[model samples]
Target chain A: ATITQDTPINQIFTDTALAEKMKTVLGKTNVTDTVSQTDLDQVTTLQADRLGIKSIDGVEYLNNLTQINFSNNQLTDITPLKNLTKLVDILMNNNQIADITPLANLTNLTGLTLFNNQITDIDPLKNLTNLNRLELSSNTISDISALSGLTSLQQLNFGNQVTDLKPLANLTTLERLDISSNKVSDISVLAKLTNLESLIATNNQISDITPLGILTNLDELSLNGNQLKDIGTLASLTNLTDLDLANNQISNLAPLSGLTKLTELKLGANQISNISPLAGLTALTNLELNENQLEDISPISNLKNLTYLTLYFNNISDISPVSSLTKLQRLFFSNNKVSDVSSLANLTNINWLSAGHNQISDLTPLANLTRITQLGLNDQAWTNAPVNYKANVSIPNTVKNVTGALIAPATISDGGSYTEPDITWNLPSYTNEVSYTFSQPVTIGKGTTTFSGTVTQPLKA
Target chain B: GPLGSWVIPPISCPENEKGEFPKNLVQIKSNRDKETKVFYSITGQGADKPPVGVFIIERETGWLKVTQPLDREAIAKYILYSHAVSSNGNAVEDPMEIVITVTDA
Candidate 1:
């Protein structure tokens, strides 16, 4: 308990787990167990993440420490780091810390991450104006007025219970901000953040995004799960590359036609019907139009850069437009009215394809796609009649997971009136025999019929 | 004393209906609407919540309409909370629970 330079580190640190990790970081395991003040002073950085450290009692001696990472630890008290004025960056995410008052005097800190904690009062961070980056997401903090003077902050994640954005209006240096999952319905204050490049404001009550029109420097923006209907103001944000407007009330795409720089776009679960406005966005590589009312996608046929495209849950029948998109790696067009997939034959690079619940009968177009790992061709089960009675075709051996009934070659027996055909199915080799169950009962000659077999064997009915 | 639960009769919506969307499921009229203009909005599993914008209310008419076809298998039923507010965003009445059951087509 005495203050001496010859004291052993194991004695100073109450938690033996932290002491052992400190010994490894300080390179003191090869020599004596004792750590002098000079040796502790030499340490300028320490990474003790996920070490189950409950206490940092001995960290006060490391006055020269400028950066420390104690993330994913069980630390509840960090009072020992109060006097470490030289600290510039501290990452204490995923800890049980509730009291952050001890970090008040560390004005030299430029970056701090206290996400997934229980800290309510952020008054301690008021004077830490030197901070450029701060993350306080998933906390119980309701008041963010304390961060008003942190004008140097460039990146901030205050996605919590705070509803008022009045305090962040002055933080003009911000370039990135994640204010998602809050009760914020108004974001007029964000208009001043012209330097912002990325902003994620998902799952909020935002309706009018007219203020975001001025933030033209933004390249990545996610306004998913909001009440927005009219997004004509976003036409000025031509610099945007990655944008997600999923699960909104938006129906128009006319405003986004000029945003040619966009590469990845998600407009799923919206009211969009016509995609003709997107005819010139040739730079798009990933696009999701699932759960919409789109019938014709010919407008995007010229977008050869597309690699991933989903058109599920729509009324699309003809998919000839996507045939020219040879770079496609993954394509989903399930729950539609598509019958011909001959256009997909040229997409040899496709690794995953889902065309189930459609009128597709021919699997010959997909036979040459040897790189396919997963294929979904299951037709929607009708109570009276089958929608899709697929033709007998051979699936590539590279397929691992195949969903839907695989119709085998039928052997018909000669009868006077009706012919009973003996059907045999060949399933994927990777499918477990026990997990395979018939989705519908096959009525063979007005009799309830059942077929069972192993993966390597054929199921006869 | 606490107010009793305001539960409306379960409404059945047939799945995969080919009818025009924004189809009227029911009109939730507040008795106070006759006296003052009532603004209606819904929030819960399918309205303003996840799978959002499926059901929307006409602010003036209180006509709750379905934006798209309901999938019975994906979601059997949706329990929604409807609130009637004044033009100034003030609560006019207590929230009401509206249950919508998606019936197989």
Candidate 2:
């Protein structure tokens, strides 16, 4: 409540009303030196391909200035919402709005979020053809073919420098495309884009796509980092649900057995020993084959609607049919060489469970799950997992624990500085409890932290 | 290649810091907003050359142009990574290395 320049902006929505907030960023498409270079080529003729909003430097009333938050505000000089074309949303981004050439007239911008703001040149809007959602991820965009003629972009995020893209094959009105960490050697040029449906190019260098033959309207595809040995070009993308080919290189699965409308399938760090293409992907409810090189998936007892299964690291020692998958909920098989989950004792509605680095000295079959929460056995000399479990349990967050990048109501702060994992402890009834220790580089990654906090406790025996 | 520009400094929890989930990380900046860039280098002709790191985050809207003919010593060792995401997971990450210099077109 200390802002100046005469405040007003509805007093910033009366100060946080939070309804999509205001924006008019990159306005004058700033090109500073106190605004010269012949006034930046005389404001690029004040026409299309606009970019204004350099950061209000001195603030010329900031114009209609509805809700422009400058989120994280490092706003250098937005040249004052140039011409106020009624900007809807433009949250600037981390400070230092590089030379946006004054936002090329803003052509009636829809939503232009510039995350990380290290915005590399976009050739001055190339004549902004009315954007829908164009978020410029961490700056330094190599070349986006001047936005492939914009064509009214739907949703575009060139996360990590967008490696050589022919400006996304002429837009065609993209649906959602996040080129995570670039260097896209060539994903067959996104198989000539059939109007992408949701594609995140995680750590790039796309290994072949068998020419993409069928993509029939992709749903959500990440393909993490690549080497992608096989999956036989995902047959035809049969309207995939959520697929992350984590860390790729591949081993085999006879090409996913069938199509079976996936619900989430991230083949973590691939190698695949075989899990019978996960039994027809039984509608797969979140399955990350972590590290990979499998041994025997025991055919997964016919995948009883698995609910989040990550086979951490790997070597496999029979998870005893994934504890009968009773709709398992978030289970990460730590390290690997599992000693038997006693067929999971019917998996009692689990939530966030990590069979920590295995070899089990007997966790007493999870004492019949009492609503388990977040669990990771880290160094499986496993004397026990009952950090206290007759009915209360939940664990995760002792080290690194970052999940493909998050932003949920995420929070966990136990012993401060950074070690939060009590998750609701309460296992008593037994004796011999007390072994908690977590520390290792632990920087966490809410996209590399600015710190969002909270503390929900329980495990204290 | 003649096309370049860079911009980062909008989503700030400390600088695209991701605080409270403000991951608006944008920093391909230059053209003198401070977070500097724009470079030049030489000496790759032989003797196992190395040193090359030309980065122009945006010395007046970083521009790049390449119609055909390339291989300026394989682009004098080029490597650029930039990011800005938030279809939901707010983000920011920039990586650049575009220094150039190689004789005989």
Candidate 3:
């Protein structure tokens, strides 16, 4: 049977979802459910992502599709795409695909993402030498020996349980790699890839980062959640801008002092006390120093360009250093020791300020700050007593959202008296006179008195 | 029990007056204003309802003022409902009807 321009799409595609999407692309309504091959030939890109499509049984009819984004779907088998060798980009992330054998002959594919799938073997992709970017993260794959020959790969996100790096040593062309959440300890093979610019190896068991010293061209690196104590090797990487070494066993900040180009640095959950080395990093705008031992924060006062600074869970008394930082929009210094917040009166740009669980008395200084929307002043306890001290605070009218202790009254006044006397109404006569004398002396009592001698008072008229 | 209706005199507002906007039409005060704060608002044809923003009432001052000139040809008369509420959003007095006659300029 020959397929013509008047062929119904339902007769071709088995999945109704994919058929409806094709009908929409071909501008054919449900009344006219036919599509032409000329319209299919004109479509070089097909985006059917998140359509709850389970099968692409008839997608082979559109062989001209060079790009297909079927990510976040319920696709389990992609055998229908075997002959579509013209595909250069295929994004099938968050699917239930285990085998990629059908894509073995897709030598023209430059990018492929199969993240969060059930793939165990990538042997079918070894011949895809033209692949430049590949994402195979969150899959049940232990052996990645198949990716050894992918020399043209510029970015690769591999692994869930694979533990060997010897297979990746030959991939020197990789400029960006994400091998996070793996069991590999030795990353000495990364030393050969000097062209690498960004790398994320978070939650790995690699402690020795001495291999990363040779990659001087690295700009962004995140090694969080790993056993790292000595970061002296990062001192020479001055081209680095964004670095996140959070949740590591690193303490010394002497190595990061020279990396002044750093704009964002996250060093939370570490054993660091002295931060004098960070006084010169003026380019920092977002710095996270939470869950550490930091008291003297005067080093950050000169970094006036800072917009977000989090110092939660530390020991600090005076925040007067950050008073001059008017550019600060969100400052979280909760669970610390600070009594006087009068220094924050001039910081009018602050919209989100969480200074809870500390010692403070009055919030009268913040009465004029109308820009503050979220003010957390709850759970206040003094350092000397176990009692929760509630600050006598009064939020402004513009502060819509508030947390913790009750707000105090705007003013306190003494008791006063208001005496409202009884209303007196004196009735007047019709002539507008208060009182009038009678024509003759008639003794009229106050209450219901009658005069019987009125006959002798009147003469002939 | 519902109080007897207090019929106020028909207020005359000139149409298309070339004067400053927000001109004071009339001040609606409540006797309870001596004790507590009263928030005044008007709703109806030329007030908070349909032809909105033409007449606005100062919540605190109880001053019912016009924002723009009212055309007598379009609508010669307006019947607005006035209300007075406490600071806690409780109605202190029943809603009163205010009849306004737009006089020709």
Candidate 4:
């Protein structure tokens, strides 16, 4: 390992036509005019992404670069990465870059992806501050106030045309904040950050979440769509465990009955219909009340740590209150007006059941469940035989004198000769019921083929 | 406050010599609409060279006119590129960056 020139190297294409297209796509054949120092000490990770580079101009002499991928290139001048500065990671995503002011002196970056380009001034990222993950999604950023002095930010995706979160109220070592779609409506400065734990402001134009209810070290909170109708100040956060107030204008969920460390609760398209405040949360395990107008889910059968349950297009037709949950494995009772699935026959650990469009007509209690493997009984009137055997439209008196040429095919052996066929048959006159279309496959022999009066019986052992 | 979009008024059009040199820049509005009807344009490179063809825009009254006169040494600064068209014509948002800067007489 005797690489000289102060060893410690990183870059290659300082953009002489992107260093001859990164030496014709890494097929490097030694010292091209610019990118050298022995081509930055022969690499340590340089994925010259999309390689249509506009101009990198000598990667500030590599200096043992630390991870550089000039993403989808068409660079509008990266200002030569401001002397690399021992970069930790930088991916220049899709470009047409509108001045990044030379990455504000490359402050030893720690993962940066300038997403979708044409950036609207990040004021050179306020001295980089050794950034800890930053993805400026879709560009056109509407002032992040120079990233509020970075403070070693921990994951940030500022895209969706941000509308002042008051410069993120001094970062505070943010833990994941995606300003979704944007046009932000006062987040009350994220209530003093407090090391936010995942907050995605979806759609935006938020209608006062009461300043995120004092953060409380949020554990995933997505304000879906917006214009929320009083989330009751998110009931003192309770360090929410994943909560998305989907589509807003909520109709009182009684402030979500104090979160209860919610385990994923997405009130899909809100309007709210007395979920009885989700029966005291019970640390719900993935519950999305789809569409919403819910017609009593009987408080989801006391949750019991439900495993993925979505009552789609709600107006639910008595789910018989989830029949004691049985630790549901995945159930979406589609449409509504559900016709007794016989309380899902003791769940039996449902593998995935969709009670499609309502008014169901007896699936014969799902026939001892048997771990249904993805089934949705379409339409419905039953009859596909799972055995509930209760049918009699008056005919069996030995098939009412069965006469189809005395039903043939009789082969005997041990307990020999067995022939059974009555005199004659006739019944279709006043229509009590008659449908006998079977000219071929017919095997109805489960009771030892008998009629009780059939003649020709050859010796029974 | 209603040019189809608003709040951007300094484009540095002071030292002029032409007569009718108007400047009533922005006023676009659209919470959606109230008779939208807006259309205006003025592209980059300072609208293309030597202060070339100054910069004129009336397109149903956005009124950003500058017939001539003002060099600031070939070009001090002008990041122009403001456009908004909507009168059944679409492009209701997105493009608007008007950084002008030039005042060193």
Candidate 5:
């Protein structure tokens, strides 16, 4: 059916709501007689995200689209999008889209997000060679064979029940890959992808990380939940700047010394004992070593670049070594055996210093730390943490808090009530004398207090 | 000679063209130990020189304030010298140079 100003409806329009959406997208105040190329070109973008749109029926006319965002719309069928070959970006995630055969012709697409959908067969993506970023996570795609030819892909997130690691061996140009929450964790194939900068494959089954050592260019690597824990192979990945090894059984950190270029390292919830190897990694700006055993953190004093350091649940007692680490802005030393914190007075740059659950009693040393914004000294030894330190005054305005100044000028507008001026006035010397002669013998009521002055030099001294 | 060490680096501020008098400028602070007594004063091109009273700083606090309206067409910038002095009239902190740039309104 053909649309016109007379018939308000077209027979080819399958969905009435979609036709109304098309009219709104085209800025049509009323039904027009003709839909020209200028009208179609104006419909370059159509977005119905989370609008409960199931079927986009009248998308056949506006084939001049370049971007479409129909995410969270519960869309099941998007066959109408096949004609939009000019689309460069299509975001249709969190829907029930099973068949993406229509997107195969959208070869010009650079970014496509279809995560949280029910799509299984991604074989149609083989033709989209220009795609640089593709998100198909939380889908039913167990077979990723179509992704083999997409060498231009820089970011690929396929966090699903994917078992085969053979299909991704050819995507060496990938910079970031997220295959977390998936099956089949033998990632030896990832060793070939040396160009990968970050890989997040947490919650997998296999734990042998020997393959990752070859990917020396990786800047970040997160492999939290897996099996077995001999990470000796990761010693050579020196370019890594950030590493998360939380919830792993690895105890010794001897291999972490070679990766001295790390700026941020997380080793929480592990069986780590000796952190002496970490002392040489001075480039670290943030170091999270919480939930570990062993004490004596004298090794961390050399980490001069460290601004944020977390050592919760350790056996540290003497913190004298921390006195020299003046650049530390935040220190999380909770659940330790630290009783004396006198060394903290020297650290004036700290903002958040948590030292809770320790045997700390005296807080007189904390008086000099005016830069501390937050303090956690709540433990058995803090029942009477000096009255001044408990006031919680992080930063003080010395001048404003003073009692008085030498000069204070407070102006009040027009007949406004002004307080008695408390300013230190600099007055000039003057004398109070009357030497005026009476013109017409004006009688002054001097005894009554209303004085009409005539001559005050009559009693010349 | 003690005052020479108190002279630190210079500070800068972007220009303002709203033409408001007694405008609040950036405060100049010095690094003093825990129980050190100190005072603040400013001098230089905009201080005791020509256009002497264009800028004034608090003696107790180091707050710098502009006294009158300025035109960027006439003067594009102003430089002032700030100092932190001890109680006995000796420089406690290094002399800091303040360059106030006048931006077009």
Candidate 6:
């Protein structure tokens, strides 16, 4: 994806060239006491996904809204969503939505996202099992002793920002989870979410995922952007459909053959060249062989079911035998020098064809293809263009909206590691501009993290 | 209210300048700085006879005399009040009410 002057998403870059795709507000809310109807007309309820609009003036018929997204919008008090008995998802995230004592009556909630807020204790969510996805990342959430009753939860993303997730062991329904980017020390408890299939735990402190062998039902797993020198555990996931081992120092992939069920293997930026283990992984449908120093095609003949393959920016001069993967639909052989598709004419089912940036001049075989969608030929070396060859592509930036969370700095205090702690805070993400105020004062500390809430993080002893 | 007069149920005291008594009382400890009555009820054989009519010590330091023979084993574990133990203002309360009991050997 090209995020440049030729793209679409980054058109609104700010003064620092950081265009915000999402804004989180955390200040006072519009109340009958604070703003009259004239002032309230302009201050509309946020339609992001969830809104906890309190209609104190009278009964404002709040039975229609589905999910509330008033997170990070410094909602100091919560007199708004008190009586809405129909609320299913409450996303009071990053906001000062601290006073949730009024939510005990909300029995219909299924998913609650209070990550990186000022909430200290969440014992109020005792009866809510409707929740399958519970996101309480980077908040002051410590003891989930109260959530043991929510046995129906299927996906929970507490990440490293939360120190202890031992209480989540009781939740046996989790499947797809995103606990990446936190200070979590151990994921051995994740062995309990036996239904888990896809887990993205990037940028965390997890040492190994071999313990997850107990859960053999995984389909997609990502352990990228961390500190794992060797991924020997990758051999255990036989049911894996998609695997991303990007951005690490993994050198040995002898374990890749065990994942014979993989559909897509993204080893884009790793430090390994031994492709022999992936020889006959016929289940591989999409393979990313980009940005690697692979020069031989000795093992490429075994992948018989490959549909889309990328061999861009490599030291390969010949690309003929690799095309024998006749199940191939779209082949990206850009920046290579191959001069013949005359032998590829036997691949009649190969409709989406692409061979650019090479010293090849024969386009007779590609002339028979018709179902091509996006074909790129962006260098001056190849003059015999294919039938559907497009010149260049304008890349679009994929901006991911990251919600705030509470992360403890490196040096943290161990409050006896008691089964319980009374009060917690993000120490106020930034300054003392507190929208949610506490009855007693809690000490807020400094941090360098993406999640800014008065919560707990891993503190070194 | 029958003027709740109190007494030391079962106690004894050492001999004083007046004379040694077998029992001690409680009210003798009150602020008898004014004038008050002293009631006594004694038991056990301390060489003293039964018709010894309730004896009295001064609202300050009073006196009592044991006219009976002493039975050491019978009066060894007896109890009395400090009012009778210290009856003289010289150190104790007067008209010291006393009530003492002694066990048989």
Candidates in order, interface RMSD in Å = 22.6, 20.3, 30.2, 29.3, 28.5, 48.9
Best by DockQ: 2
Give lDDT per model, in order: 0.73, 0.52, 0.71, 0.61, 0.65, 0.49
Candidate number that wins on DockQ, 2 or 5: 2
lDDT (C-alpha) at residue A100 in model 3: 93
Native interface contact recovery, all models = 0.00, 0.00, 0.00, 0.00, 0.00, 0.00
Candidate 2, position A48, lDDT: 12
| Residue range A349-407, candidate 2, lDDT tens digits | 87446554466433456655656534444344333334443443455542222332222
Alpha-carbon deviation at A212 in model 5, angstroms: 2.0
Per residue, candidate 1 scores C-alpha lDDT tens digits across A1-461 of 22475777787777878888877877886333887777788889998876778899988888799999887679898889888999998888768999999999999999898876888989999999999988887688888998999999987886568899999989999988888677899999999999999888877899999999899999989898899899999899999998889879889999999999999888878999999888899999888898899898888788899988878889998999999899987687877887777898899887656665666544556656777644555543111122222223121221111223354322211111111122223333322211111232232112221221111222122
Point to the candidate with the largest lDDT. Answer: 1
Model 1 pairs whose backbones collide: none
Q: Each prediction's DockQ?
A: 0.01, 0.03, 0.01, 0.01, 0.02, 0.00
Best candidate, TM-score: 1
lDDT value, residue A363 of candidate 1: 54
Weakest 10 consecutive residues of candidate 5 chain B by summed lDDT:
B1-10
Residues A36-121, candidate 4: write the lDDT tens digits: 35645555567766556677766655566788877666888777667667778887766788888887887878778776688888
DockQ of 5: 0.02
RMSD of each: 18.5, 20.7, 25.7, 24.2, 23.7, 44.2
Docking quality (DockQ) of candidate 1 = 0.01
Candidate 3 scores an fnat of 0.00
User: Which model, 1 or 6, shows the larger DockQ?
Assistant: 1
Which should have the higher lDDT, number 4 or number 6?
Answer: 4
Question: What is the TM-score (0 to 1) of candidate 2?
Answer: 0.29
